[PDB]
Design a protein around this nucleic acid. Structure first.
Ligand SMILES: Cc1nn(C2=[SH]c3ccccc3N2)c(O)c1[C@@H]1OC(=O)c2ccccc21
Ligand SMILES: [Zn+2]
Length: 357
DNA sequence: AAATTGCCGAAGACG
DNA sequence: CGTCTTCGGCAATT
């Protein structure tokens, strides 16, 4: 029954080839444009992130996430209040004379001027794309992405996300995050945390304004690794290993949410990352590969559902990397919303998920 | 050195 | 299920 639904969600290869071909051609053009003398954003390198590159994209290959990461040495972080996720950026010492001073505001490296330039360049370059139908969607407070809209003729969107790369140790609000010791283990956790961390120009919302110079932590790269390396056994989902249902559960919970979001705008606050964050916790709670045996798909999905209902009910979903940061705090998602989603989920759960049709 | 090449895992397609 | 395929990712090579 859930097998059937998964069959429908599964991406068709033909559809992937036509989408990738177009998406890739456009990104390499923008990446290439981004280099090339002049621009502040030279040494940017590409990192593909997102449901698609984690292989958990459903229904259609019509959403692509791309990080344009920039290595910036000698930066100091100041925690924006006690958010844990948001920061101000300064430099160790004076530039002499170097690219990113035209994004400063005194000593602070403002996310907003840096993003506005980045968007301006992307816009001038999309202007010149003649063989493909692509446009830049209008700006949005609360998003760090310059979003492309591609009609292939199918509608495809590409979020191009500027990122600052920092090679130093992770900020201490992450010190007790990534709790994978009993699952992926201590050597993996330590190795993961020796990788760089990234900041993206999503501004912290103070009230109903946005604090324009703040940046947000991003662990898209880390999350991408974990999806490709998700078992306690090294052979999970390999040719000489056992298939598990972890990813299948993530897709099912994704589908469920996205359907409810379609016909209910009481849910615009919710999103996929909530479901992703939740399943990460499930994977920590149930680290054994044997617990996610495909035979057990139904009970694994329902356990995920029960856990997600419990997060809603108790108004608490800890960020997986930054345990201070409550994604289900009253300030980000109002109580009323959380109860509405709870009743809809509970409804589908007890009625054999009619919305799956 | 910016662009090509080689290698192979993840997973779709098909019987 | 096995096998064959395309795509993504990576870094050695020119
Ligand atoms: C609510 C939400 N949070 N969210 C976060 S919170 C956060 C904290 C630290 C790092 C990433 C991050 N993403 C996120 O990606 C979302 C959804 O993804 C979005 O880009 C977005 C946009 C509007 C509503 C919800 C989301
Ligand atoms: Zn697995």
């Amino acid at each position: 029954k859930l097998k059937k639904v998964l069959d429908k969600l599964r991406l068709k290869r033909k559809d992937i080839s036509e989408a990738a071909e177009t998406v890739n051609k456009v990104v390499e053009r923008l990446l290439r444009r981004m280099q090339k003398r002049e621009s502040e954003f030279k040494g940017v390198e590409q990192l593909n992130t997102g449901s698609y590159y984690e292989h958990v994209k459903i229904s259609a290959p019509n959403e692509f996430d791309v990080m344009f990461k920039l290595e910036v040495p000698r930066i100091e972080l100041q925690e924006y209040y006690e958010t844990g996720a948001f920061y101000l950026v300064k430099f160790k010492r004076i530039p002499r004379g170097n690219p990113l001073s035209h994004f400063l505001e005194g000593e602070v490296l403002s996310a907003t001027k840096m993003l506005s330039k980045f968007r301006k360049i992307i816009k001038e370059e999309v202007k010149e794309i003649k063989d493909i139908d692509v446009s830049v969607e209008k700006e949005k407070p609360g998003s760090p992405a310059v979003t492309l809209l591609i009609r292939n003729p199918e509608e495809i969107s590409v979020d191009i996300i500027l990122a600052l790369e920092s090679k130093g140790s992770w900020p201490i609000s992450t010190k007790e995050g990534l709790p994978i010791q009993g699952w992926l283990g201590t050597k993996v956790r330590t190795n993961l945390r020796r990788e760089p961390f990234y900041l993206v120009p999503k501004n912290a919302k103070d009230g109903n304004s946005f604090q324009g110079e703040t940046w947000r932590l991003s662990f898209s790269h880390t999350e991408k690794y974990i999806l490709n390396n998700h078992g306690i056994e090294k052979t999970c989902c390999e040719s000489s290993g056992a298939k598990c249902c972890r990813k299948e559960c993530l897709k099912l919970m994704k589908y469920l949410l996205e359907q409810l979001k379609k016909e209910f705008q009481e849910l615009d606050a919710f999103c996929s990352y909530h479901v992703k964050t939740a399943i990460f916790h499930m994977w920590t709670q149930d680290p054994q590969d044997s617990q996610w045996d495909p035979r057990n798909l139904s009970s694994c999905f329902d356990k995920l559902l029960a856990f997600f209902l419990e997060c809603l009910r108790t108004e608490k979903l800890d960020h997986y990397f930054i345990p201070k940061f409550n994604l289900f705090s009253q300030e980000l998602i109002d109580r009323k919303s959380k109860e509405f989603l709870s009743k809809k989920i509970e409804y589908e759960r007890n009625n054999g998920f009619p919305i799956f049709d």
